């Protein structure tokens, strides 16, 4: 899909009105063709994808807008799809060369503080500047009235551009201020090189530096380059999210480059005194971060991964490495933020159709496509893994399921097999496959600041992004031919993660890694402040304030929720602690609250709700001091995107 | 736009009930197929996954007919092999519509036996045990979040033999958790088929010998409010004609006096005459303020414009329905041009023309050419007061006799006189009786919708929405009366007619308490008479919920209530009640929006967090939730609440 211009906002002194130029059918066709003959006029376009509508402002002969709406998408144009000229994920800014007929606003350098925000409804909202990227609405408005206006201009009185709107600053679901991308960030972006080669590892610098390495999985980014550095005489640490990949490196390196390295995972540890160590991020955090002077170079592998341990591990390194004596951090991934999937030479891509004995996410699989050989099928849930595995087994296909919870020994490693699995596979098992068949959806978690009474953490099924598609497809075609089959050809933009991931980081810090919320904030802040990494909204003070209130948890419930191994074991266990001390029942008797089951006969009355982590069946009271505390925390300034 | 089959749910041949889905169309194919109404793909399976541009749900063929929900499909056609298929059955009251099953389509068959173990099929092909507890209700064996059931409406409930018991249309929820499911029984599908496919309501009924409720679906200028009661009067019957508009009511009476001979009784706030005639013209508000039906006074009651869903009208009609038989009436007539289920058909006096981007006057993303309005009598419907004032301004500056009209302004500001462009809200339709050479329609209106948002209680939010058939049909109606007329529009779209939000029920209790001295219990009886009567606009049964809420709100401040009644805005009771609770705690209102002006003079003495009862708009001030009324309302949210799927 391409981005499509579906209207415009005309400026004149400052007033505006808007014009629509496409309906739905036109938008969709134009988005599939990427061919737009419609004449472009104005400095503000109203634009749309198949999922959202927003604005775009031309400045300096460039049409600009937000990464969180456009991603890395092309813009439909007279002669076809227009590739983006600039892609600055870190500033939430992208830009296409202005098409013929378009006008540009000029930047503002008189430096006025009385500003005017233009919306998708063509209203003109006065704004008092507060900083480089903040302004306060003179009249607070409900957040919903700014929705769809991301990308609109912030104008000084003389009509020039100060920047583009990117998000509202809410206080309890009401917008008192606005975040914008300032015109100086636009000019900085324009002077940066479009091509920047991150395929070569850099040489060790004289003083501390953070460098990026974008290279295919099996370039030797985690094998050959660590070996090269060690030859030059350095001590190198390779961090990786998979236990099975970390272990695998030990045997590979001892054969191929004659180095028997240190290995550090939770299930196994080996110290050989070698100058190269391979660790998981999680085991790295358990060992208490950087040891003063132990390493010259730290290589954070798969730094595209947006799981809490990886983010927390990488932010720890970014906070500590210099102080502990390192000269070099290398952030390594094949799929960096802003990447899209491109054709792979070694992999042949074939859409699924409706003909097939095996129904699969609305489409079908031919039994002839998986009868012999080794094939991997990605499903979104374990329930689905289980039922597809059973089907296949009943047809006499040798088929097995894999997901979080199961021992990887369900393998088999040699022989005909179909593996039906979730993304747990990515970290659990390292082999590749004659084909990958991919449902193209993922389970993820999303926070909702629902003030009912506090927040909600919802589990939802959503389309895959560009990293998911590439990483799943990349389980076939490794040094040998391969096939990838898909239910749908789409792709969400890569490199963003939800605020629940942040909440997860504080939770794990408390549950697993003996980190105070203040400590956790320091480490995440280094992650945020370092560019070229995945991006999120800055909700650190909020989440810090919330967990900071969660005191004197019951150690047995914590142990039990960690043991059962599910999400947010600290939030779950803290709610259970409050329920037990208040002598009151849990929100439900879902498996989530089984730590309270022996107390079931004696718990009665309304649940002192702290927050929603699933369905709430029981009645709730709001009188508990901890609830009162978390409600007060919601008055904090919260960026939400528009 | 037609409904389009975009996929299907395939049920298992034997053993235990299981299913899987197949998708036969993408988005592009869906949109094209909806605009042409032509679907050459063949129809397999008995459970279809259907879609409009706006939403998607399920449809289930039983005994020859592809059934689904009115709240999903409205009166729309089904895309077919030889073009659009019109609906064969349209039952607004049961939330059930039906197209004749296309070629070779397969139909489930009814639950002949009579088990009480049931299985619901969802759009995800999940099969979910249900326990029948009534004709149209069964409980989920394992309660679920209601989000999981959205888009499954129209799906079947099966008995273990795989026979259809009905089709899902809504969940019963407790605080966001579906505990049970509502369906349209299969025998309500056969009650639908053992009626005639066409019913006639174009002629006023004969007076029956015993109490009967009849419907009159006939256009304005058929004389529904002048000629027909005149006719009944001529046969010696006493007749009451009720209407939502003061100006319409006065006009009919004045027309009757000079044309049909009679000098009728008139009853409104502003003018009331007793002449002893056997025809009486009243508004719904005055009828209610008079305490409803007085014994033996009328044989016939015409409830005119019975399509209207303002609180007064609903409350008024509810009253007549509850009180007429016992007051000795023989006949209640529910009269409208635009009954529930109706569609905007072409009018031979009216030339319909799409606005373009060509024009000097920007209008809702399109354009009005000055030529089209420079000379004559013209009407422009805008959704908000604000826009009307912007558009009157922008028009007159360019040399026009432009004027606005919306609630608050006195009519007569609309002259006549000749050349004019009136820019107005829908308030035009209760304030002014005249018509125009052309009508220009923004195709949108403001409405109010309730969210059970548990933050802490409920929210009532003003939103802007696409117009429905009634809206479009009534807005067009102000041109092409006798002579030729023109209708210009921004959008061809049209939402289904005859549904109203739960917030409208809220307004009925509020008006009950604020204007007409009705206890919540007394209002429930009246509303119950309206729901139970068929062929009237329909809503979700939340009567107990809303009764329970207003029953708690006692000892309101008489002064604030008088000011919110006078200012004329919605929910004067809830607004005044929140203010009563604020003033008594010396706390500020949730904001300093105009809604809270009754409290402006006390601003100096009002400090601290607002004890919030519910949300009627943005809340800027901190909130406490400790107030006994807040808690009382919080407990009411435990009620069983039907919500759609
Ligand atoms: C410029 C501020 C930075 N924190 C930032 C950078 C890029 C993007 Cl897409 C940002 O917004 C989101 C919004 C939702 C999810 C992730 C990120 C974002 F908030
Ligand atoms: C059969 C139950 C009846 N109360 C009923 C009849 C028709 C329809 Cl469209 C119903 O559903 C709605 C849903 C939303 C708004 C109004 C009505 C509905 F609830």
Domain ranges of chain A: 1-105, 107-190+635-642, 191-339, 340-497, 498-631
- Nearest-CB residue to A25 (from B10, B35, B625): B35
Dist CA A604 CA B525 (whole Å): 37
User: 3-state class of A89 per DSSP?
Assistant: helix
> Smallest CA–CA separation between B508 and chain A, in Å?
27
Backbone angles phi, psi at A600, to 5 degrees: -60, -40
Q: Is A217 annotated as belonging to a binding site?
A: yes
Smallest Cβ–Cβ distance between A359 and the set B20, B618, B622 belongs to B20
Q: A36, A92, A301, A432: which one is catalytic?
A: A92
List Cβ<8 Å contacts ≥24 apart for A535-540. Answer: A535/A89, A535/A90, A535/A92, A535/A337, A535/A495, A535/A496, A535/A497, A536/A496, A536/A497, A536/A498, A536/A499, A536/A501, A536/A502, A537/A167, A537/A499, A537/A639, A537/A640, A537/A641, A538/A639, A539/A499, A539/A502, A539/A638, A539/A639, A540/A502
Q: Was A63 annotated as part of a binding site?
A: no
A220 labelled as ligand-binding?
Answer: yes
The whole-angstrom distance between residue A381's C-alpha and the CA centroid of its chain comes to 19
- Residue A315's nearest CA partner among A90, A532, A514, A527 is A527
Radius of gyration of chain A (CA): 26
Please give the C-alpha separations between residue A49 and each of A62, A69, B53, B531, in angstroms, as whole numbers.
19, 8, 15, 42
Residue nearest to atom 4 of ligand 1 (CA): A537
* Residue A141 neighbours by CB under 8 Å, 6+ apart: A125, A174, A175, B618
Q: How many helices (H) and strands (E) does chain B have?
A: 17, 33
Q: What is the CATH number of domain A107-190+635-642?
A: 2.40.10.10
**b/e string for A197-211 if b means 16 or more Cβ within 10 A?**
ebeebeebeeeeebb
Cβ-based contacts of A359 with chain B (< 8 Å) = 10, 20-22
Q: Which residues of B are catalytic?
A: 71, 95, 153
B177/A615 Cβ within 8 A: yes
A contacts of B32 (beta carbons < 8 Å): 25
* Six-digit token string for A303: 């730094």
Alpha-carbon distance B99 to B74, whole Å? 12
CA triple B386-B390-B393, angle to 5 deg: 140
Question: Which of B444, B448, B411, B403 lies closest to B427, judged by CA?
Answer: B411
> Do strands B459-466 and A93-97 pair parallel, antiparallel, or not at all (unpaired)?
unpaired
Which residue among A168, A311, A537, A543 is best mutated to probe the pocket of ligand 1, counting the most ligand atoms within 8 A of its Cβ?
A: A537
- The verdict on whether omega for the bond into residue A453 sits within 30 degrees of 0, i.e. cis, is yes
Residue pair A330/A301 in contact by the 8 Å Cβ criterion: no
Q: What is the CA radius of gyration of chain B?
A: 26
- Distance, in Å, from the CA atom of B185 to the CA atom of B157, rounded to the nearest integer, reads 9
**SS3 assignment, position A351:** strand
- Give the whole-angstrom CA distance, residue A13 versus residue A15: 7
Around ligand 2, the residues with Cβ closer than 6 Å are B 70-71, 92-95, 499-500, 538-541, 644
Helix H, strand E, coil C: the string for A355-416 is CCCEEECEEEECHHHHCCCEEEEECCCHHHHHHHHHHHHHCCCCEEEECCCCCHHHCCCCCC
Would you say domain B343-500 falls under CATH 1.10.8.60?
no
Method used experimentally: X-ray
Strands (E), B146-210: 156-158, 164-174, 177-185
Write the residue with the smallest CA distance to atom 4 of ligand 2. Answer: B540
Ligand nearest to the CA of B644: 2
Q: Which among A7, A140, A451 is the nearest to B365, CB-wise? A: A7
CA of A541 to the centre of ligand 1 (A): 16
> What does CATH list as the number for B501-634?
1.10.820.10
Angle at B531 between CA B427 and CA B243, to 5 degrees: 35
CB neighbour class for B376 (10 Å; exposed up to 12, middle 13-18, buried from 19): middle
Q: Looking at CA atoms only, how far is residue B33 from chain A in angstroms?
A: 11
Which of A568, A566, A563, A600 lies closest to A584, judged by CA?
Answer: A600
d(CA A78, CA A534): 33
Other beta carbons within 10 Å of B139: 18
Question: Which tokens in the block code for residue A393?
Answer: 């087994």
Centre of ligand 1 to C-alpha A495, Å, is 10
Note whether A20 contacts B366, CB cutoff 8 Å: yes
DSSP state of A292: T
Ligand 1 pocket (Cβ < 6 Å) reads A 67-68, 89, 91-92, 496, 498, 535-538, 641
Measured over the CA atoms of residue B446, residue B450, residue B451 and residue B457, the dihedral's sign is positive
Asked whether the beta carbons of A234 and A296 are under 8 A apart, the reply is yes
User: In B, which residues are within 8 Å of A619 by CB distance?
Assistant: 638
A633 marked as part of a ligand binding site: no
**Which residues sit directly before a break in chain B (C to N > 2.5 Å)?**
16
Distances from the Cα of A315 to the Cαs of A167, A205, A251, B88, in angstroms?
A: 25, 21, 29, 64
Integer Cα distance of B372 and B385 in angstroms: 23
Q: Give the ligand with the smallest distance to the CA of B504.
A: 2
Q: Yes or no: is domain A191-339 CATH 3.40.50.2000?
A: no
Which position has the token pair 């549904």?
A: B499
CA distance B49 to chain A (A): 11
Contacts of A615 in chain B (CB under 8 A): 143-145, 176-177
What phi and psi, each to the nearest 5 degrees, are found at residue B298?
A: -135, 140
Centre of ligand 2 from the C-alpha of residue B136, in Å: 14
Best residue in A2, A5, A28, A623 to probe B by mutation, most B CBs within 10 Å? A28
Instruction: Determine the topology of domain B194-342 in CATH.
Output: Rossmann fold (3.40.50)
Which of A17, A29, A451 is facing B455, going by the closest CB pair?
Answer: A451
* Per-residue three-class SS string for A521-533: HHHHHHHHHCCCC
> Do B110-193+638-645 and B194-342 fold alike per CATH?
no
Give the separation between CA B410 and CA B404, rounded to whole angstroms.
10
CA–CA separation, A100 and A241 (whole Å): 47
Give dist(CA B384, CA A566) in Å, integer. Answer: 51
Domain A498-631 architecture: Orthogonal Bundle (1.10)
Looking from the CA of residue A538, the nearest atom of ligand 1 is 4
- What phi and psi, each to the nearest 5 degrees, are found at residue A415? 105, 165
Residue-wise DSSP of A94-160: EEEEPPTT---BPB--S--SEEEEE-TT--EEEEEE-SSSEEEEEEEEEGGGGTT-TTPEEE-TTS-
| Residue A320 token pair | 């500590």
Spatial separation of the C-alpha atoms in residues A594 and A581, rounded to whole Å: 16
On chain A, the residues whose CB falls within 8 A of the CB of B31 are 24-25, 28
Q: Report CB contact under 8 Å: B32, A17.
A: no
In this structure, CATH architecture of domain B110-193+638-645: Beta Barrel (2.40)
Closest ligand by atom to B341 CA = 2
**Phi-psi bin for A148: left (phi > 0), alpha (psi -120 to 50), beta?**
left
Q: Which two tokens stand for residue B296?
A: 């033996």
Nearest-angstrom CA–CA distance, B614 and B509: 16
Tokens 């069964």 correspond to what residue?
A: B138
From B374's Cα to the closest Cα of chain A, the distance in A is 22
List C-alpha distances in Å: B492 to B37, B149, B218, B442. 16, 31, 24, 11
Collect all residues with Cβ–Cβ distance below 8 Å to B515 and sequence separation of at least 6: B285, B288, B289, B565
Q: How far apart are CA B440 and CA B460, in angstroms?
A: 30
Judge whether A326 and A208 are in contact, CB under 8 Å: yes
Written as six digits, the tokens of A55 are 């604005």
**For A218, left (φ over 0), alpha (ψ -120 to 50), or beta?**
left
Cα of A149 to ligand 1 centre, how many Å? 16
Q: Which top CATH class is A1-105? A: mainly beta
CA angle A90-A91-A97, nearest 5°?
Answer: 110
B10–A25 C-beta distance less than 8 A: no
Rounded CA-CA distance A310/A312 in Å is 5
Among A489, A611, A619, pick the best mutation site for testing chain B contact (most B Cβ within 10 A): A619
CA distance A350 to chain B (A): 17
**How far apart are the CA of B169 and the centre of ligand 2, in A?**
9
Q: How far is CA A580 from CA A550, A603, A608, A621, B348, in A?
A: 15, 7, 10, 15, 74
Strand, coil or helix: what is A492?
strand
Run of H or E residues at B515: helix B502-515
- Rounded to whole angstroms, the Cα distance separating A167 from A418 reads 45
For B78-152, where are the E strands, in sequence order? 89-91, 96-100, 117-121, 127-132, 137-145
In angstroms, rounded to a whole number, what is the distance separating the alpha carbons of residues B193 and B181? 24
Phi-psi sector, B68: left (phi>0), alpha (psi -120 to 50), beta:
beta
Kindly give the distance from the C-alpha atom of residue B15 to the centroid of ligand 1, in angstroms, as a whole number. Answer: 51
Give the one of A28, A140, A364 whose C-beta lies nearest to B28's C-beta.
A28
C-beta atoms of B23 and A362 within 8 A:
yes
Q: Which ligand is nearest to the CA of B185?
A: 2
Task: Please give the CATH architecture assigned to the domain spanning A340-497.
Answer: 3-Layer(aba) Sandwich (3.40)
Crossing angle for the helix pair A517-529 and A499-511, to the nearest 10 degrees: 140
Exposed, middle or buried, A351 (CB in 10 Å: 0-12/13-18/19+)? exposed
A619 HSE (CA, 13 A, CB side): 14
Distance A161 CA to ligand 2 centre (A): 50
CATH number for the domain whose boundaries are B1-108: 2.40.10.120
Phi and psi torsions of A520, nearest 5°: -50, -40
Taking a C-beta distance cutoff of 8 angstroms, is the pair A494, A467 a contact?
Answer: yes
Is residue A12 part of an annotated ligand binding site? no
d(CA B314, CA B302) in angstroms, rounded, equals: 14
Distance CA A393, CA B499 (A): 50
Of the candidates B310, B320, B264, the residue with the CA atom closest to the CA atom of residue B290: B320
Burial-class residue B23 by CB neighbours within 10 Å (0-12, 13-18, 19+): middle
Protein residue with its CA nearest to atom 9 in ligand 2 = B71
Angle at B105 between CA B104 and CA B108, to 5 degrees: 130
Q: Per the structure block, which two tokens stand in for B443?
A: 């195709």
């Amino acid at each position: 899909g391409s981005v499509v211009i579906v209207g415009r906002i005309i400026l004149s002194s400052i007033t505006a009105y808007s014009q629509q130029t496409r309906g739905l059918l036109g938008c969709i066709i134009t988005s599939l063709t990427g061919r737009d003959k419609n004449q472009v006029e104005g400095e503000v376009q109203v634009v749309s994808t198949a999922t959202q509508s927003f604005l775009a402002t031309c400045v300096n002969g460039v049409c600009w807008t937000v990464y969180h709406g456009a991603g890395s998408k092309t813009l439909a144009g007279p002669k076809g799809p227009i590739t983006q000229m600039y892609t600055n994920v870190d500033q939430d800014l992208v830009g296409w060369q202005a098409p013929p007929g378009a006008r540009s606003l000029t930047p503002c350098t008189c430096g006025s503080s009385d500003l005017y925000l233009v919306t998708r409804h063509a209203d003109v909202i006065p704004v008092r500047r507060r900083g480089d990227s903040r302004g306060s609405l003179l009249s607070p408005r409900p957040v919903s009235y700014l929705k769809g206006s991301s990308g609109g201009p912030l104008l000084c009185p003389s009509g020039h551009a100060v920047g583009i709107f990117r998000a509202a600053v809410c206080t309890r679901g009401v917008a008192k201020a606005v975040d914008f991308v300032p015109v100086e960030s636009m000019e900085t972006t324009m002077r940066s090189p479009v091509f920047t080669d991150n395929s070569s590892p850099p040489a060790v610098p004289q003083s501390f530096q953070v460098a990026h390495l974008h290279a295919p999985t099996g370039s030797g980014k985690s094998t050959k380059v660590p070996a090269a550095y060690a030859a030059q005489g350095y001590k190198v640490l390779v961090l990786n999210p998979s236990v099975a990949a970390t272990l695998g490196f030990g045997a590979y390196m001892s054969k191929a480059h004659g180095i028997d390295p240190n290995i550090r995972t939770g299930v196994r540890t080996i110290t050989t005194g070698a100058p190269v160590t391979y660790s998981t991020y999680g085991k790295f955090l358990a060992d208490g971060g950087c040891s003063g002077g132990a390493y010259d170079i730290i290589i954070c592998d798969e730094c595209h991964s947006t799981d809490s341990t990886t983010i927390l591990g990488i932010g720890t390194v970014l906070d500590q490495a210099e102080t502990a004596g390192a000269r070099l951090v290398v952030l390594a991934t094949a799929t960096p933020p802003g990447s899209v999937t491109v054709p792979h030479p070694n992999i042949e891509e074939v859409a699924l159709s409706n003909t097939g004995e095996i129904p699969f996410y609305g489409k079908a699989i031919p039994i002839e496509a998986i009868r012999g050989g080794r094939h991997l099928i990605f499903c979104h849930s374990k329930k689905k893994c289980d039922e597809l595995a059973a089907k296949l087994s009943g047809l006499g296909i040798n088929a097995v399921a894999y997901y979080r919870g199961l021992d990887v020994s369900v393998i088999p490693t040699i022989g005909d097999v179909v593996v039906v699995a979730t993304d747990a596979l990515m970290t659990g098992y390292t082999g590749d496959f004659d084909s990958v068949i991919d449902c193209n959806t993922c389970v993820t978690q999303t926070v909702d600041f629902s003030l009912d009474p506090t927040f909600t953490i919802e589990t939802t099924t959503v389309p895959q992004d560009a990293v998911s598609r590439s990483q799943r497809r990349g389980r076939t075609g490794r040094g040998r031919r391969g096939i990838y089959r898909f239910v749908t050809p789409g792709e969400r933009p890569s490199g963003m993660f939800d605020s629940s991931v942040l909440c997860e980081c504080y939770d794990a810090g408390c549950a697993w890694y003996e980190l105070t919320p203040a400590e956790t904030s320091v480490r995440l802040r280094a992650y945020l402040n370092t560019p070229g990494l995945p991006v999120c909204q800055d909700h650190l003070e909020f989440w810090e304030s919330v967990f900071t209130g969660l005191t004197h948890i019951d150690a047995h419930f914590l142990s039990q929720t960690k043991q059962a191994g599910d999400n947010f074991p600290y939030l779950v266990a803290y709610q259970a602690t409050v329920c037990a001390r208040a002598q009151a029942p849990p929100p439900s008797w879902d498996q989530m609250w089984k730590c309270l089951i022996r107390l079931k006969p004696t718990l009665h009355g309304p649940t002192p709700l702290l927050y929603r982590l699933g369905a709430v069946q029981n009645e709730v009271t709001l009188t508990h001091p901890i609830t009162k505390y978390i409600m007060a925390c919601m008055s904090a300034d919260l960026e939400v995107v528009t």
